[PDB]
Each structure stands twice: as C-alpha cells, then as structure tokens.
C-alpha cells in the first residue's frame with residue numbers, strides 16, 4: 126500500500142525531528158516529533174499537498190483562535206510545501222476512546238462520566254464562543270494530558286471538520302440548503318444524517334450520545350453499519366429511554382437540546398447546571414480517582 130506521508134527520522138523546518146507515527150485516521154497522519162528549539166516532544170499533524178480534501182488550514186485557524194482557552198493544545202507551528210502541509214501542537218496522553226475500551230463492559234462510572242462530560246461541554250461552549258462548530262464530537266477527539274499537572278484535564282484534540290458559523294461580528298450565517306456530512310455515523314445528530322447545515326445543538330447531540338455510551342457501554346445503533354439505517358433509527362428513537370442510566374437532571378439537558386435548532390443559541394449555563402447539580406448530588410469531588418487510575 127502507500128508509505129507514510131513523512132519518513133521517520135526527517136527534520137521538518139530544521140526543527141521538528143519525526144520520531145514515530147501515532148495515528149492515521151481522518152484526513153492525514155499524526156506523529157510524535159522532537160522540537161529541537163524547546164527540547165520537548167510535540168504532536169505533528171500532516172496531510173499530503175495533493176490529497177483531494179485537506180483540512181489542516183481549518184485545524185490551524187481554529188487552534189489559533191482558541192489559544193488562551195482551556196481544553197486545547199498549545200499551538201507550536203505550521204507550514205505548507207510541495208509535498209505536505211503540517212501543524213505542530215502540544216502532545217497529549219491517553220485518548221478517551223482507548224480509555225473507554227479498556228474498561229470492563231466498555232463503561233465508565235457516573236463519577237468519571239460526569240467529570241469528563243462537564244469538561245467536554247466546556248470545550249464545546251469554548252469553540253462555539255470563537256464562532257466555529259466542531260461537527261465531529263466523538264471520544265477519539267479527546268485525550269487526557271500526559272503530565273501530573275495535565276493528566277486530569279481533557280483536551281479537544283482535532284478541528285479538521287470544523288466550520289465557521291458566524292459572520293461580520295457574530296451574526297449566525299445563513300445555512301446552506303444541503304450540507305454533505307463527513308463526520309462519524311455513530312455519534313452524528315439527525316441533522317447530519319439529513320445533510321442539513323449543522324448547528325451548535327448538533328455538537329451537543331453528539332456529546333449526549335458520547336455520555337450515554339460512557340454509562341451504558343453502547344448505543345442502540347451499535348451493530349447497524351448502513352448510515353441511512355442509523356439515521357432512520359435516530360429519527361424515530363425516543364431519546365428519553367437514554368435517561369434511564371443518567372442522573373435525573375439529564376431530563377433537563379435532553380429537553381433543552383431537543384428544543385434547539387440551527388438558529389437558536391444553546392442555554393450553556395442551563396446545561397452546565399445539569400453537570401454541576403448532578404456532581405453535587407452524587408458527592409463527586411475533582412480529586413476522586415478516574416476509572417483508569419483505580
């Protein structure tokens with residue numbers, strides 16, 4: 126088949142020494158590199174300069190817009206040449222998709238679920254606040270940090286499928302009649318399935334599906350491969366059934382996101398209160414071990 130975009134061992138811009146490929150899903154590849162200026166390991170994302178769909182221009186735009194914010198990697202560099210385009214950013218640790226799969230039955234406790242969920246909601250409100258939709262909320266786009274000071278922090282890792290949803294000084298942009306969905310079938314909202322323009326609420330639907338999968342270990346459409354068959358299930362599904370294993374205030378969360386549409390700003394403070402109230406009811410404190418620690 127095709128070789129890796131980068132040969133391990135090469136130096137990018139006389140600074141970043143490529144050490145090992147660490148991922149290859151999506152629209153490119155990701156490497157662990159040594160930054161010889163700062164003398165630290167970093168993540169290096171690359172795409173071929175010839176591939177049909179290139180997303181690192183969006184990655185750089187959103188990463189830069191989010192600098193200073195929580196739950197995002199530090200921006201380190203970027204470039205474009207005849208062979209490849211690249212973006213350099215902070216290296217993180219264990220990926221939530223991997224951590225969930227390491228559990229018995231693929232479930233997290235409500236303690237771990239609520240704390241991760243609240244951090245993920247923070248990260249969604251943050252990207253929305255700078256005028257972008259994520260459009261690809263799924264567990265493999267989040268990781269815990271890899272140091273003592275960062276390993277209790279969850280980071281939003283990738284922005285390739287993002288879209289700017291505001292124009293002028295933060296007016297919502299008129300939606301397109303048709304928008305071809307390129308995200309993940311499992312966590313996609315009904316609107317993605319319908320090839321509708323996605324909104325802020327579609328990222329909150331994907332978070333709702335991730336939280337349910339965290340507590341239950343599976344979604345009702347786990348075994349269905351056909352995208353249209355998944356969409357049909359979601360269109361008809363009584364999402365109240367998913368409240369069974371969530372804390373009671375998730376009825377407020379689900380009622381709220383069900384009420385939303387492309388043109389309606391979410392009540393983020395309401396959704397945050399669901400997590401805050403649930404965490405207090407269950408006596409969860411931030412220092413409690415996550416499931417992978419104990």
Ligand SMILES: c1ccc(Oc2ccc(Nc3ncnc4[nH]ccc34)cc2)cc1
Pocket residue numbers: 147148150155168198214215216217218220222223265266268282283
């Ligand atoms: C399912 C699918 C893919 C998968 O492998 C990943 C490898 C690296 C990443 N990305 C990152 N990792 C570590 N530090 C990072 N800073 C920026 C991005 C980044 C994400 C996933 C894990 C489970």
